[PDB]
Amino acid sequence: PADQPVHNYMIKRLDRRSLNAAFSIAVEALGLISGENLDGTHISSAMRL
Amino acid sequence: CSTLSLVRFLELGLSVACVCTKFPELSYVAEGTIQFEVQQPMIARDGPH
Structure with a gap:
């Protein structure tokens, strides 16, 4: 005997990933x-820059 | 009540001992120094000397 034409469905699920990068700044x-901490000088301004 | 009697340094007589001066970056200053120049006189002897 013959055969009918077949159908089918399916699903694929996601997955979780992530990135990161530290950025430490000082004291x-x-x-x-x-x-x-800024002082009024001509030298503290340059260090702030 | 009591009132506090303020005192100002330059009005004392002790100020004739030191040359005060502002220096608003003394916290950034490592070893600091001052130099002296001096040359002695001389007399021109005679004889065995």
């Missing part, structure tokens, strides 16, 4: 960035 410099 003495975080004092100068925020202007807290």
Whole structure:
């Protein structure tokens, strides 16, 4: 005997991945960035730059 | 109540002992120095000397 034509379905699921990268910034410099530790000189400004 | 009696240094007599001066970057300063120049006189002897 003959045969009917076959159908089918299917699904494929995802998966999870991620990236990352550390960025550490220092102590003495975080004092100068925020202007807290900044002093009024012609030398502290250059170090902040 | 009591009132505090303030005192100002330059009004004392002791100030004639030192030459004060501002220096707003003394915290950044490592060993600092000062130089002296001096040359002595001389007399021109005679005889065995």
